[PDB]
Design a protein around this ligand. Structure first.
Ligand SMILES: NC(=O)c1ccc[n+]([C@@H]2O[C@H](COP(=O)([O-])OP(=O)(O)OC[C@H]3O[C@@H](n4cnc5c(N)ncnc54)[C@H](O)[C@@H]3O)[C@@H](O)[C@H]2O)c1
Ligand SMILES: NC(=O)c1ccc[n+]([C@@H]2O[C@H](COP(=O)([O-])OP(=O)(O)OC[C@H]3O[C@@H](n4cnc5c(N)ncnc54)[C@H](O)[C@@H]3O)[C@@H](O)[C@H]2O)c1
Ligand SMILES: NC(=O)c1ccc[n+]([C@@H]2O[C@H](COP(=O)([O-])OP(=O)(O)OC[C@H]3O[C@@H](n4cnc5c(N)ncnc54)[C@H](O)[C@@H]3O)[C@@H](O)[C@H]2O)c1
Ligand SMILES: NC(=O)c1ccc[n+]([C@@H]2O[C@H](COP(=O)([O-])OP(=O)(O)OC[C@H]3O[C@@H](n4cnc5c(N)ncnc54)[C@H](O)[C@@H]3O)[C@@H](O)[C@H]2O)c1
Lengths: 251, 251, 259, 251
C-alpha cells in the first residue's frame, strides 16, 4: 500500500513506464508522469485522474539538467514530496561498434545514464530533507547483465545503471533512501506484434530462445515488481537488481 | 493471496522457517511444517490452527530419503497437493578447513544440499502431475554469493543451492514449476545465537559491518519476500536469487 | 616457470588433467598424477620422465579420506613439498531431477565436492607448515556459473566449488595459500567425443548441428575449448608472483557466460 | 611473445598504463603511448627506444573523436597495424550524488566510457581488415563490480565498461578480435604513499581492509595480466573480466 506516497515515473507516456504509473496510482500513490512526449504524459495523467487517482503530466527531457530540476521541483510543490523515483525513459539505437555513430552513442548514454543521474540528484534533494527517505528504482534490462551484438550503447548504459544504483544504496542508507534496478526481459509490444509476422517460430526461438519457457515478460510483471519494491517495509533489498525475464540470465 | 495453495516448509519449527510458515498460513495457504524436531513442527501447526488456519506437523529428517518421501506424500494426501516447497532446514558448524572434520563436512552437505535435492525430487513428482505446477524456494544466504572464513562447508553448500535452483528453473518450466533462492543477511535466530559466543562488538562490527545501514535482516523481511515469490502471477522470476541483506553483497 | 615446485593433479590420467600435468612438468614442476586409474597415471608420469621431467603416478580415490591423506603425504615425502594442488577428477551422470538417483547424487558430490575438500585439507597440512604457502586450483565448469537441464548434480557440485575456493582464499591468505577456480567450456575429451554422435542420433539433427548449435551455441565463435587453453590458464595462475588473483574464477569457454 | 605485434596504450604517460607499455615493449611489441600529457607520453616512448624497443608518443585526448581517429591512424601508419588496444586513461572525481557536478559527471563519462568507445571503434577499422584480428583490453576496477560511496561517476563508468567489452566479444569474434576487462584493486601510488602518514593501520584497515591479505595490488600484477591476455593463443578468454585485487570482490 502506497497511500500518501508520491511517485515520479520518467518515460511513463508509453509501455513499461505507463503501466508502472497506472499501478502505483492504483495502489494509492500520487503519480507524476514525466516524459518528453508531453501530450502522452497528460493522457496518462488524465486517465489516472478520471479513475479517481491523483496524477500530473510533466514535460521533461531527462537529458536536460534544468528541465529535470524544474519538473522534479514541480512534483514536490504539487504533491508535497517525491517519495518514489522510477528512472525509466529509454530508446534503442542499433549498429555494430565499428559503424556506431558517436552522436548516437552519446544520446544513448545521456538518456539512459545521465537521465538516471540527473533525476536522482534532483529527487535526493527532496528525499534527504529531514531524512524522510525514498525509493529510487532504475529500469535496467537483462542487458544490464548480458550482452547482445549490435547493442553496444544500450548494453553499456544498462550495465552502468547497476553501478549508480549500488553507489546510491551506500550513500542513501543514512537518509532512509533505498535503490534498486529492475531488469526486464523481452516485453511484447505493438512493435513486437508487427515483427513476429515480419521476421518469419520467431517467438520461441529468435525472440525468446534464451528464456526457459518461451513466454514474453509483461508490463504487469515489471510493474508488480516495482510495487513490491516500492512498498517494502525495510531497506533489506537496497542495492539489488531484479531480473524479470523468464530465466534469461540467472543470478 | 495463497488461498487454495498448499505449502511445505522444511526447518519451520524455528527461526526463519517458522515465520515463513506463519505468514504463508495467514495468506491462506495450508501449511505443512516439516522438521527434524517433530514436536516443534506440531507446535507451529497448532499455533496456525488455533488462529483459524490449516496446518500439520511432519517429522522429516531432510537427510533421509525415506523420511522425505514419506513426509511429502503425507502432505499431498492430507492437503491434496504440494504447490509450494520451501527448502529451509539448515545448521552451522564453524572451523578452519584444516580442523574441519570430514564427518562434519558430510553432515553439512547432507542437510543443506542433499536435503534440498531430496525434498525437490519428492515435491516434483506431485507438481509435475498433469503439469499442475509449483514454486520451489531454497533458503540460501549471502554466503551463496560470498565467503567468510571458518565456514567452508556452509559456504560450499549455499553456493551449491544456486546451481540446483538454476537447473530446476530450466527443467521445471515445461511443467509450470518455478525456482528461486532467497538469500538473507544476518537474522536473529538460534543458528546465529549458537555462533556468537564462540566468535555486541561481534554483532555491530563483524556481522552488521557488511550492511549499508547496520540493521539485521528480520524474519519478516525474508517471509515477505517468500510470499511475493509464492504469489507471483507468472514464471518471470524463475531461476533468480534474491539478496535480502540490507546491502551486504549487491548483484 | 615452476622449477623447484611440486604439483599434484587429480584425475590426470586422461583429458584435461593429463594435459595440465604435462604442461606443469614442462614448466619445471615435479608432478604427481593422482587417479583411480593407476596404470593410466603411471603412463602419464612415464611420458613426463622420458621427456626429462620429474613425475610419479599415485593411485588415489579422491572420495576416500585415507587414500587422499596417504597419497598426498606420499607426494610430500617423494618430492619434498606439495606446492600446487589441482583438484580435477570428475564424472558426469545425467537425469532430470524428478528421476535423479540419490546413489548417483551422492557419488557426484563425493567425487567433485568431497574430492576437492579432502585433497585441499591434506595439501594444507603441508602448505601451512612454516607458512610455506601454495596454490590450490579447482576445476569447475561454465556450469559453476550457469545451468543446463538434466545436470542438476554436476551443476550443483561445480557451483559449490566456487564457495569452497572463496573460503580458502580468505583462510589461506595468512599462510601464503591462494585459491582459484578454472571454468572450461566444452573440451573434446573422450566422454565428449562420445556425446556428439549420441546427441546427434537422439536429437535427430546432424553432427555438425549438435556441435555448432547445441554444444557451442552459447560461445561467440563456435570453437571448442582445448586442453591447451585450460592448461595455459593453470600455468599462469600457478606461476603468478603474488596473491592478486586469489579467490577468483576464470571462464575459459570462448564467451559462453561472461563475467 | 608479442614480437611483430603492435600495441596502443591510452593513459600510458603515468601509473598503470606506463607499466603496461613498458612490459608490452619488453615482450617485443611496438608500443604507442597515447596520452593527453604529450610530454609524459614522449618520455615513456623515449625510455622504451633507449632500451632497444620501438615506441612512439601520441598526443591524444580520448574524449575527442577526431583526436582518437587521427592518433590511431598514426599508429597504423607508423607500425603497420594496431594489434592490441589497452583503453586505460582515467581520472577520479569524488562527491556525493546529490552534490555531484553534472560537468564532472560528463567529463568522467567522456574519459572512461567515450574513450573506450572511440578508441575501440577506431582500432576495429584496422583489426577487422582481412580479419587480421586483435585484442582489446579495457582498464576497469573492482569498482566495475562493487560500489563505494562518493564515487558514483567512476563506479557507473567502470560498470559500463563491462557492457561494452561483452558486446565487443560477441561482435568481434567473427573478425578474430577478443575483448577483456582487467580490474585492478587498490594500487599503491606515490599519492597513496603520502596518505598513509596523513591518516601500518590505515593500510590494512582503511585502504586494504577488503582484501584477504592486506597487500597492495602492483602495477606489475596488472601488466602481467595484460601480457597474458595479449598473448593468449585462442579466443577462449574473450568477454571476461579479471579481478586483480588480492581478494577484494570474488567472482
Ligand atoms: N520493451 C522491452 O522489451 C524492454 C526490456 C528491458 C528493458 N526495457 C527498458 O524499459 C524502459 C521503458 O521501455 P519501453 O519498452 O516501455 O519503451 P517505450 O518506447 O514504450 O517508452 C519510452 C518512453 O520514454 C520516453 N522518452 C524517450 N526519450 C526521453 C527523454 N529524453 N526524456 C524523457 N522521456 C523520454 C518516450 O517518449 C516514451 O514515452 C527503457 O528504459 C527500456 O530500456 C525495455
Ligand atoms: N539466521 C541467519 O542469519 C541466516 C542467514 C542466512 C541464511 N540462513 C538460513 O536460513 C535457514 C533457517 O535457519 P534459521 O536461522 O531459521 O535457524 P534455526 O536454527 O532457527 O532453524 C533451523 C531449523 O532446521 C531444523 N533442522 C536442522 N537439521 C534438520 C534436518 N536434518 N532435517 C530437518 N530439519 C532440520 C531445526 O530443527 C530447526 O527447526 C537455514 O538454511 C540457514 O542456513 C540463516
Ligand atoms: N570435458 C569437458 O567438456 C569439461 C568441461 C568443463 C569442465 N570439465 C571438468 O574438467 C575436469 C576434467 O574433465 P575431463 O573430461 O578431462 O575428465 P573427467 O571429468 O571425466 O574425469 C575422468 C578422470 O578422472 C578420474 N577419476 C574419476 N573418478 C575418480 C576418483 N574417485 N578418484 C580419482 N580419480 C578419479 C578418471 O580415472 C579419469 O582419469 C572435471 O572436473 C570436469 O568436470 C570438463
Ligand atoms: N590506481 C588504482 O588504484 C586503480 C585501481 C583500479 C583501477 N584503476 C584504473 O587504472 C587506470 C589507470 O589509472 P592510474 O591509477 O594509473 O592513474 P594515473 O593518474 O597514474 O594515470 C592517468 C593517465 O591518464 C591520462 N589521461 C587523463 N585524461 C586523459 C584524456 N582525456 N586523454 C588521454 N589521456 C588522459 C593522464 O595523462 C595520465 O597519464 C584508470 O582507468 C583507473 O581508473 C586504477
Amino acid at each position: 500500500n502506497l497511500n500518501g506516497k508520491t511517485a515520479v515515473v520518467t518515460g511513463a507516456a508509453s509501455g513499461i513506464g505507463k503501466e508502472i504509473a497506472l499501478e502505483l496510482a492504483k495502489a494509492g500513490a500520487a503519480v507524476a508522469i514525466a516524459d518528453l512526449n508531453q501530450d502522452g504524459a497528460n493522457a496518462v495523467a488524465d486517465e489516472i485522474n478520471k479513475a479517481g487517482g491523483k496524477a500530473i503530466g510533466v514535460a521533461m527531457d531527462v537529458t536536460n539538467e534544468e528541465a529535470v530540476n524544474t519538473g522534479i521541483d514541480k512534483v514536490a510543490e504539487a504533491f508535497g514530496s517525491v517519495d518514489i523515483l522510477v528512472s525509466n525513459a529509454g530508446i534503442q539505437i542499433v549498429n555494430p561498434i565499428e559503424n556506431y555513430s558517436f552522436a548516437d552513442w552519446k544520446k544513448m548514454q545521456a538518456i539512459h545514464v545521465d537521465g538516471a543521474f540527473l533525476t536522482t540528484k534532483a529527487a535526493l534533494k527532496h528525499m534527504y530533507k529531514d531524512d524522510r527517505g525514498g525509493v529510487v528504482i532504475y529500469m535496467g534490462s537483462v542487458h544490464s547483465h548480458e550482452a547482445s551484438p549490435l547493442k553496444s550503447a544500450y548494453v553499456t548504459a544498462k550495465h552502468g545503471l547497476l553501478g549508480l544504483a549500488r553507489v546510491l544504496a551506500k550513500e542513501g542508507a543514512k537518509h532512509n533512501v533505498r535503490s534498486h534496478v529492475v531488469c526486464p526481459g523481452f516485453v511484447r509490444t505493438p512493435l513486437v506484434d508487427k515483427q513476429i509476422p515480419e521476421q518469419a517460430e520467431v517467438i520461441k526461438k529468435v525472440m525468446l530462445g534464451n528464456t526457459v519457457d518461451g513466454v514474453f515478460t509483461t508490463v504487469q510483471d515489471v510493474a508488480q515488481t516495482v510495487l513490491f519494491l516500492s512498498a517494502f517495509p525495510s531497506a533489506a533489498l537496497t542495492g539489488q537488481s531484479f531480473i524479470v525475464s523468464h530465466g534469461w540470465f540467472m543470478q
